[PDB]
Structure 1
């Protein structure tokens, strides 16, 4: 009885998107109060991003070279600063639709919503997790840089991601809103590996609890095991280790279903070594790891937030 991947309402973020052009070359920015945030890649053409010295490139661009347009109206840029990999453009007008907001740096395994935007206009909204190798697996095509990822706590928006790069392997990399990349990546076009993309174990377990809360539980066995026993099977299949913190976090879901966390681990261990054998769980032929335990809590009794 049903449990969709779904994103936060995006209205509060739509009201913050603008178009930023430098060298008539265009991408997205985020307008909060009287500051516009965008990737510092705006000042680059090519070669530049083949070998960019951002400090020297920024030397003789100036305030008037940054063209910021919002809705259909032009913002006046009255200053600018580079902080890590983002440019801050001070404008002389506060965004009168600025929401309550915070800037967070999140953590692999964390989920968030992305509002994919093209030259300042939002076109789609969807969910992802931050992967354990510090990439995300998004849908970003040309002009999408500067699109942001966000969470919400009923009223206030938690901005956690800004899109900068697509690696040659097709996965995506970006920064927090202070301009620091997640993981080892840089805003240049050379060579840079993503490491192993391990499965986020605690999220899979939360999703299995969701599946039970809706009655799709052929996979419930009876076996139990221990943390160490389970983790020894986890390395095998490049699942992230599970620890007590993650057991603790799953507590409310065990409380409600009556299924002990380590018993659910035992079903997962059996599934990893047996494979669905043609069955599905909640409409999926594989084990989904893009739901956190709190995501499940927002649905897993379908009662989000107050």
Structure 2
């Protein structure tokens, strides 16, 4: 029984957490095979972070300027490169604890597990979600730059995020393990707009479905609704417009519970038009949008 925010085991990712020092900056790195992946802003000082020409700054930096330490060992950077916004430090020793990995880019809404690290050593793990505005509301301090977000599919750890910076809005932004940023964010110290963060409707419905599996049924209503007029209500409350493909995603949840997905959209309509009036759907007085339907199926088995 039960249902809560759960993250993947971080054991296969802890073995790839190294500390990359480039002078005064200390951040984390991803050691897969003989390549160490770290944010490329490790070559920027502090005043360089405002207007950084990474091509020119990388020219000044040599191979011996990157210090990679895996616990208490030392890897020799025998080649420095810069793929988009990430640095691929080619090292000598290949990581013997390299799990079966793949570099994948997630879609806005999907969830992943972040292993926060400081000075290369992991500190904690929590399940985040790529918000529609491509931001991430997580827990990152001054040394959390370089921490990765991963989903573990079977025995293959799929890395999909790397923390890069903390926006002045309070949230965080990063990139995939290839180098391309998530959203309209650049690795500079300028004021960047995050945008209006909308609510993931397909994830909220999956969260409401798990509530019926666990015992929370008060939000269930006798009314039904259409897929279009629900959006007309959802678009006013800044909710993502539910698609027919998303209805197919909630197929097994609609089957195991016996409640049609369109009947769930009518219950959510009353949850927004009339509010919750204070209750505890699984333990929250608000509606959770950081639970993908796969997370509900894999947990409420």
Q: Same fold (TM over 0.5)?
A: yes
Give the C-alpha shift of residue 71 in structure 1.
1.3
Deviations 1:222-246 (A, max 9, x none): 1101110100000110000001000
Q: Which residue of 2 aligns with 1:213?
A: 213
Question: Is the 2:24–2:45 contact (alpha carbons within 8 Å) kept by the matching residues of 1?
Answer: no
Q: Kindly tell me the number of residue pairs found equivalent between the two proteins.
A: 301
Give the C-alpha shift of residue 204 in structure 1.
0.3
Q: Which residue of 2 aligns with 1:246?
A: 246
Q: Which residue of 2 aligns with 1:145?
A: 145
Secondary structure, counterpart of 1:161 in structure 2:
strand
Secondary structure, counterpart of 1:160 in structure 2:
strand
TM-score between both structures, scaled by the size of structure 2: 0.99
Deviations 1:243-271 (A, max 9, x none): 10000010000011110000011101111
Secondary structure, counterpart of 1:286 in structure 2:
coil
Deviations 1:8-49 (A, max 9, x none): 000000000000000132100000000000000000111110
Q: Quick one: distance in 1 between partners of 2:206 and 2:191?
A: 36
Q: Quick one: distance in 1 between partners of 2:257 and 2:24?
A: 57
Q: Quick one: distance in 2 between partners of 1:153 and 1:52?
A: 37
Secondary structure, counterpart of 1:149 in structure 2:
strand
Q: Which residue of 2 aligns with 1:29?
A: 29
Q: Quick one: distance in 2 between partners of 1:283 and 1:4?
A: 9
Question: Is the 2:10–2:125 contact (alpha carbons within 8 Å) kept by the matching residues of 1?
Answer: yes
Give the C-alpha shift of residue 79 in structure 1.
0.6
Deviating beyond 6 angstroms after TM superposition, the runs of 4 or more aligned structure 1 residues are none
Deviations 1:108-143 (A, max 9, x none): 101000000001000000011101001000100011
Secondary structure, counterpart of 1:37 in structure 2:
strand
Q: Quick one: distance in 1 between partners of 2:294 and 2:6?
A: 13
TM-score between both structures, scaled by the size of structure 1: 0.97
Q: Which residue of 2 aligns with 1:195?
A: 195
Q: Quick one: distance in 1 between partners of 2:191 and 2:218?
A: 45
Give the C-alpha shift of residue 158 in structure 1.
0.6
Q: Quick one: distance in 1 between partners of 2:252 and 2:278?
A: 31
Secondary structure, counterpart of 2:151 in structure 1:
strand
Gaps of 5+ in 1: 302-306
Secondary structure, counterpart of 1:71 in structure 2:
coil
Secondary structure, counterpart of 2:37 in structure 1:
strand
Secondary structure, counterpart of 1:290 in structure 2:
coil
RMSD, aligned CA? 0.7
Gaps of 5+ in 2: none
Correspondence list, 1:125-140, <5 A: 125-140=125-140
Deviations 1:175-222 (A, max 9, x none): 001110001100001121011100000000001000000111111101
Question: Is the 2:63–2:78 contact (alpha carbons within 8 Å) kept by the matching residues of 1?
Answer: yes
Secondary structure, counterpart of 2:81 in structure 1:
strand
Question: Is the 2:100–2:156 contact (alpha carbons within 8 Å) kept by the matching residues of 1?
Answer: yes
Secondary structure, counterpart of 2:232 in structure 1:
helix
Q: Quick one: distance in 2 between partners of 1:281 and 1:60?
A: 56
Give the C-alpha shift of residue 7 in structure 1.
0.4
Deviations 1:27-77 (A, max 9, x none): 000000000000000001111101101000011211111000001111111
Question: Is the 2:78–2:91 contact (alpha carbons within 8 Å) kept by the matching residues of 1?
Answer: yes
Q: Quick one: distance in 2 between partners of 1:70 and 1:179?
A: 22
